[PDB]
A paper describes a structure:
Using Alpha Fold 2 and Small Angle X-ray scattering, it was found that CagI forms elongated dimers mediated by rod-shape N-terminal domains (CagIN) prolonged by globular C-terminal domains (CagIC).
The K5 and K2 interaction site of CagI consists of a hydrophobic groove formed by α4 and α5 residues. A single residue difference between K2 and K5 in the C-cap moiety of the DARPin generates small but significant changes in the DARPin/CagI interface. As a consequence, the surface buried by complex formation is slightly increased in CagI:K2 with 994 Å2 compared to 974 Å2 in CagI:K5. Comparison of the structure of CagI205-304 (from the CagI:K5 complex) with AF model monomer showed that the prediction was indeed remarkably correct, with a rmsd of 0.9 Å for 103 Cα. Crystals of CagI:K5 and CagI:K2 diffracted to resolutions of 2.0 Å and 1.8 Å, respectively and belonged to the orthorhombic space group P212121 with very similar cell dimensions. In contrast, a 30% reduction was seen with bacteria incubated with K5, and even a reduction by 40% and 60% in CagA translocation after pre-incubation with K8 and K2, respectively.
Author numbering:
A (entry chain B): 205 to 304
B (entry chain A): 16 to 138
Write the structure that this text describes.
């Protein structure tokens, strides 16, 4: 259970950075799209996999840009980051059910 | 052991990193995005794990599939002490992603002014 706590701590350490920088990333630029993938989406996937593993939760989080209908790349990035956080809440609800 | 090292280096499990290295984990292990453990620890700010990876032969200038180096990702996240350690171990300040962005560029665009000044000095 210690490992799971360690995963939550890493996730929240990552999130504090991702949540502020996401507002500055232009998702429509080549570099911004790549940085979002490398530094936001990819770590999120690893955290979500580590969170779900010990509880049998096997889900694959995927970005949904169709739900971010904005011309401004900065607002797309903030919208996609919101999806990441929502997925965290979804997995946590599943875990709490398992534990209960 | 590579996937366990990538996970422990991202999460910040110092003990587990040391155990994995002592059991012969590949310091060059790569995730599905081209990241090495050092990419993930530098981005996260995990200093001691960064030092452990460097001491065990990590390429300080490895590129992930999106063209970012560990210096890029530390400059992005705002980890000044990491940036300084990477530079001391030969990190390339002129590394560019696939559209020409350097570590300085990322620091400037993302508002990490201290790092941007350090990288400009080094250039």
């Amino acid at each position: 259970i210690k490992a799971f706590e360690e995963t939550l701590k890493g996730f929240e350490t990552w999130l504090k950075v991702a949540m502020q920088k996401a507002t500055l990333i232009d998702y429509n630029s080549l570099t911004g799209q790549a940085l979002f993938q490398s530094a936001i989406y990819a770590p999120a996937l690893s955290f979500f996999s580590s969170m779900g593993a010990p509880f049998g939760i096997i889900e694959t989080f995927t970005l949904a840009p169709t739900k971010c209908p904005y011309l401004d790349g900065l607002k797309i990035s903030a919208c996609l980051m919101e999806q990441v956080i929502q997925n965290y809440r979804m997995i946590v609800a599943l875990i709490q059910n398992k534990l209960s | 052991l590579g996937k366990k090292l990538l996970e422990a280096a991202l999460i910040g499990q110092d003990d587990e990193v040391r155990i994995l290295m002592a059991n012969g984990a590949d310091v060059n292990a790569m995730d599905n995005f081209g990241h090495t453990p050092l990419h993930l620890a530098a981005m996260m700010g995990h200093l001691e794990i960064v030092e452990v990876l460097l001491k065990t032969g990590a390429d300080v200038n490895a590129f992930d599939l999106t063209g970012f180096t560990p210096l890029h990702l530390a400059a992005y996240a705002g980890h000044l002490e990491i940036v300084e350690v990477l530079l001391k171990h030969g990190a390339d300040v002129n590394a560019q992603d696939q559209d020409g962005a350097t570590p300085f560029d990322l620091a400037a665009w993302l508002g990490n002014e201290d790092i941007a000044e350090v990288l400009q000095k080094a250039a």
